[PDB]
Amino acid sequence: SMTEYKLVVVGACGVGKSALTIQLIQNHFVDEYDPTIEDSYRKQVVIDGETCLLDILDTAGQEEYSAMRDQYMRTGEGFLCVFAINNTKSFEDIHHYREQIKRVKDSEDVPMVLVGNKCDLPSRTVDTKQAQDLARSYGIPFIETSAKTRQGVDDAFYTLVREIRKHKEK
Amino acid sequence: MVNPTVFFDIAVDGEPLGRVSFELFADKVPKTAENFRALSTGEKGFGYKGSCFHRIIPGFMCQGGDFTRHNGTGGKSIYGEKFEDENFILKHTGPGILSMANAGPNTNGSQFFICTAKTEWLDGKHVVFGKVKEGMNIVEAMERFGSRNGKTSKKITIADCGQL
Ligand SMILES: CCn1c(-c2cc(N3CCN(C)CC3)cnc2[C@H](C)OC)c2c3cc(ccc31)-c1csc(n1)C[C@H](NC(=O)[C@H]1C[C@@H]1C)C(=O)N1CCC[C@H](N1)C(=O)OCC(C)(C)C2
Ligand SMILES: Nc1nc2c(ncn2[C@@H]2O[C@H](COP(=O)(O)OP(=O)(O)NP(=O)(O)O)[C@@H](O)[C@H]2O)c(=O)[nH]1
Ligand SMILES: [Mg+2]
C-alpha cells in the first residue's frame, strides 16, 4: 500500500523532541515537561504529491541510558537530531548523537536532519551560521523550528522523509 | 522516635485491590518523610487521595503522586512546588523501596516511586525515604497493569490514604 517511513527523534533532554512530535501529530503545544521514556506515533501525510505513513519514535534524552540507544538506531530509517538554539550543550551533544548513529549503522551515510528548535525564544546562544556550517560539514539538511509556533515542524519531518527516499532509491 | 507509618488503599478501575503500608524514614530524612506523611493525610488541603499511579513498568517500579495535573507532570510539596534533595544516605536496595521522583537536582515535589527490583543506578540521584511494610504483593499486583513505557491499561488509584 502506502510506504511507511521509520523516523527516530533524538537529542538531549529538554530540547523539544516530544513537543515537535506532538505538534506534528496532534497540532498542539503545552509548556509542561513530561520527560519521555519512549513513545511511538503514526501519521499519514502527503509529501511531494504522494501519501505516505510516518512511524515516529520519540526517544528519551536521559544521559543515564545512553548505552541503550543501539536497538532503536538499528531499526530506524532516518533520524531527526534535535538541539535547542538557547542551549549550547545540547548543540555540542549533536556530534555525540550522530557519531553513535554512524557506529550502530556502521555507515557515514545515514538519513538525518539537524534541527535547531526553540527559535521563538530570545537570547539565542547557538548562531544560525554556526549550525548551518555544521550541517554542511555533515552533508545533511539543517532546519530551524519552534514547536511552540509550529515554525518549520512539517518541513523538518518532511525533509527527513525525502532524505530516506533518496537513500532507499540510491 | 518511632518512624511514622502511612497507608494507601489501592483501587483498579474503582474496585478495591488492597492496602499497602509504608514506613517513612524520619530518622534519616525527616523533611522528605514529613512531606509524604502530610500528603498522605491530606491535612494541608491537598494530597494523594484520589490520585493515580501514572507510570508502571514491570520489572522496575510503580510511580505516582501527581495530584495537581493528573498527567505525570505535576505535583507539589508541602514546602512549595519543589524542594531540595535532603540527602542520599539510603540506597535503592531492592523491592519495596519508596523514593522521590524528580526532574533533576533539587526538584522534589510530590511524585514518588516504589521499586519492584533493585535499582542501584538511581542511588545518589533520587532521595530514598521509606519502604513498603505491609502489602508488597499489592504493589506486585499493580505491575499487571503496566507496560514497557509505563502507560497503564487500567486506572490505578489511591482511593484512600492516611497515617496509621
Ligand atoms: C532507556 C529506557 N529507559 C529505562 C530502562 C532502563 C533499563 N535498564 C536495564 C539495565 N539496567 C542496568 C539499567 C536500566 C531497562 N529498560 C528500560 C525501559 C523499560 O526501556 C523502555 C528507564 C528509563 C527512564 C527514563 C527514560 C528512559 C528510560 C526517564 C525519563 S524521566 C525519568 N527517567 C526520571 C523520572 N522523572 C519524572 O518522571 C519527572 C516528571 C516527574 C516529576 C523519575 O523521577 N522516575 C523515578 C525513578 C524511575 C524513573 N522515573 C523511571 O521511570 O525509570 C524507568 C526505568 C525502567 C527504571 C529506567
Ligand atoms: N519556547 C519553546 N519551548 C519549547 C519548545 N519546544 C519545547 N519547549 C519546551 O521545552 C520543554 C521540554 O520539551 P520536551 O518536548 O519535553 O523536550 P524533550 O526533548 O522531549 N525532553 P526528554 O528528552 O526528557 O523527553 C517543555 O517545557 C516544552 O514546552 C519550543 O520550540 N519553544
Ligand atoms: Mg520527550
Q: How far is CA B3 from the centre of its chain?
A: 17
Which DSSP letter does residue B75 get?
A: -
What residues flank ion ligand 3 with Cβ within 5 A? Answer: A 17-18, 36
**CB-based burial of residue A93 (10 Å sphere; 0-12 exposed, 13-18 middle, 19+ buried)?**
buried
Alpha-carbon distance of A32 to A22, in angstroms, equals 12
Domains plus CATH for chain A?
Answer: 3-169 (3.40.50.300)
B111 is catalytic: no
CATH topology of domain B5-164: Cyclophilin (2.40.100)
Resolution stated for this PDB structure, in Å:
1.4
Kindly state if the Cβ of A62 falls inside 6 Å of ligand 1: yes
Report which of B133, B137, B157, B158 is spatially closest to residue B5, judged by C-alpha positions. Answer: B133
Active site residue B126: yes
Question: Using an 8 Å Cβ cutoff, are A82 and A118 in contact?
Answer: no
Specify the residue for cell string 519495596. Answer: B96
Domain ranges of chain B: 5-164
B60 part of the active site? yes
Nearest to B22 by CA among B126, B99, B104, B102: B99
Cα B93 from chain centroid (whole Å): 16
Calculate how far, in angstroms, residue B18's C-alpha sits from the geometric centre of ligand 1.
26
Whole-Å CA distances, A44 to A52, A56, A145, A151, B8: 6, 11, 21, 20, 44
Q: Evaluate whether A107 touches A78 at the Cβ level (below 8 Å).
A: no
How far are the Cα atoms of A64, B106, B162 from residue A6, in angstroms, in the given order? Answer: 25, 37, 48
Kindly state whether B59 is in contact with chain A, defined as any CB-CB distance less than 8 angstroms: no
Scored b (16 or more CB within 10 A) or e, B48-61 reads: bbebbbbbbbbebb
- For residue A130, give the 3-state DSSP assignment: helix
Q: CA gyration radius for chain A?
A: 15
Chain B: residue whose CA lies nearest to A32:
B73
Beta carbons of B10 and B54 less than 8 angstroms apart? no
Experimental technique, in short, is X-ray
* Of A16, A78, A76, residue with least CA distance to A47: A78
Cell of A121: 525564544
Q: How far apart are CA B48 and CA B30, in angstroms?
A: 19
